[PDB]
Design a protein around this ligand. Structure first.
Ligand SMILES: *[C@H]1O[C@H](CO)[C@@H](O)[C@H](O)[C@@H]1O
Length: 244
C-alpha cells in the first residue's frame, strides 16, 4: 500500500514584485504509484511562520494550483522554501510530499524573447516551449527553472510603447535553486542568444513554418531604472554603470 507520489520532487517557481493577490504561481500534481489515480488528492502547503499575519501562498485543495496570498512589493530576491503535501482519499488516505521554492523577481531579472508569431500561439503552447527553454538553461546552470512572466504583443516604437499583436514578446526569467534568486539577466541573455539557432529549430514543431525567435532583448523597464539612478553598481568588462 503505497503513498501518493508527486510528479516532481522539487517545484520551482517565481513571482514578480507586482504580482496580484491570488495570482497563479504553479500547479502541482500527485498520483497513486499503482493505479495512476489522482481524483481524490487533497493538496496542502506547509509554510513557516510569516510576520504580520501574512500567509505567503495558498493551494487549491483539489486542483493543486498554488496562488499568492500576499503582495510582494519591494521584495525582489526574497525566497520562500516550503513543502506541499498530497493526501489521498480526500485527506483520509496516505500522504506524499514535495519541496517548493518560490523566488521574488522584478524586471531587472528578466529578458524578452521576441517572436514573429502571435501571443495566442505562444500562450497555447507555453508548456512545451518552457520545457525547451529549461533544457538550454539547465545545461549551463543545473536545476535552474525558467519562469514566464508575461506573454504579450510585440512592443516597439518609441520607448517600446507600440503593440503589434501579429508578433509576440515573451518575458521570462530563470530561478537558480543554489542561490534562491534569479539568474543574472545578462547570463540568461548569453544562454539563450548563444543557442538561438538551436532553440529556433526546437521551436519549429510549435511555431510552424516560418516562425522563429527574432531576438532576445532587455525589458524597457531596466532603462527607466538607470535613469532614476537605482540599482547601479560595478559590472565586469565595462566602465558604464548597469542596474543590478
Ligand atoms: C496558473 O497560471 C500561470 C500563468 O498565469 C501558470 O504559469 C501556472 O502554472 C498556473 O497554471
Amino acid at each position: 500500500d503505497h503513498p501518493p507520489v508527486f510528479q516532481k520532487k522539487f517545484y520551482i517557481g517565481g513571482v514578480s514584485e507586482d504580482a496580484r493577490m491570488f495570482a497563479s504561481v504553479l500547479r502541482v500534481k500527485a498520483t497513486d504509484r499503482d493505479t495512476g489515480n489522482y481524483s481524490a488528492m487533497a493538496y496542502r502547503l506547509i509554510i513557516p511562520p510569516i510576520k504580520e499575519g501574512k500567509e505567503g501562498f495558498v493551494v487549491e485543495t483539489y486542483t493543486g494550483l498554488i496562488k499568492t496570498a500576499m503582495l510582494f512589493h519591494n521584495m525582489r530576491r526574497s525566497y520562500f522554501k516550503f513543502q506541499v503535501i498530497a493526501t489521498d482519499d480526500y485527506g483520509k488516505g496516505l500522504s506524499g510530499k514535495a519541496d517548493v521554492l518560490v523566488s521574488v523577481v522584478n524586471q531587472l531579472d528578466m529578458q524578452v524573447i521576441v517572436s514573429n508569431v502571435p501571443p495566442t500561439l505562444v500562450e497555447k503552447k507555453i508548456e512545451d516551449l518552457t520545457e525547451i527553454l529549461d533544457r538550454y538553461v539547465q545545461e549551463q546552470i543545473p536545476g535552474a527553472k525558467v519562469v514566464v512572466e508575461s506573454i504579450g504583443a510585440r512592443r516597439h516604437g518609441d520607448a517600446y510603447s507600440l503593440e503589434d499583436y501579429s508578433k509576440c514578446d515573451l518575458t521570462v526569467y530563470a530561478i537558480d535553486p543554489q542561490t534562491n534568486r534569479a539568474i543574472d539577466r545578462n547570463e540568461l541573455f548569453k544562454f539563450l542568444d548563444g543557442k538561438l539557432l538551436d532553440i529556433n529549430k526546437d521551436f519549429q514543431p510549435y511555431y510552424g513554418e516560418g516562425g522563429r525567435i527574432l531576438e532576445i532583448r532587455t525589458p524597457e523597464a531596466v532603462t527607466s531604472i538607470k535613469k532614476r539612478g537605482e540599482s547601479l553598481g560595478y559590472t565586469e568588462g565595462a566602465s558604464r554603470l548597469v542596474p543590478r
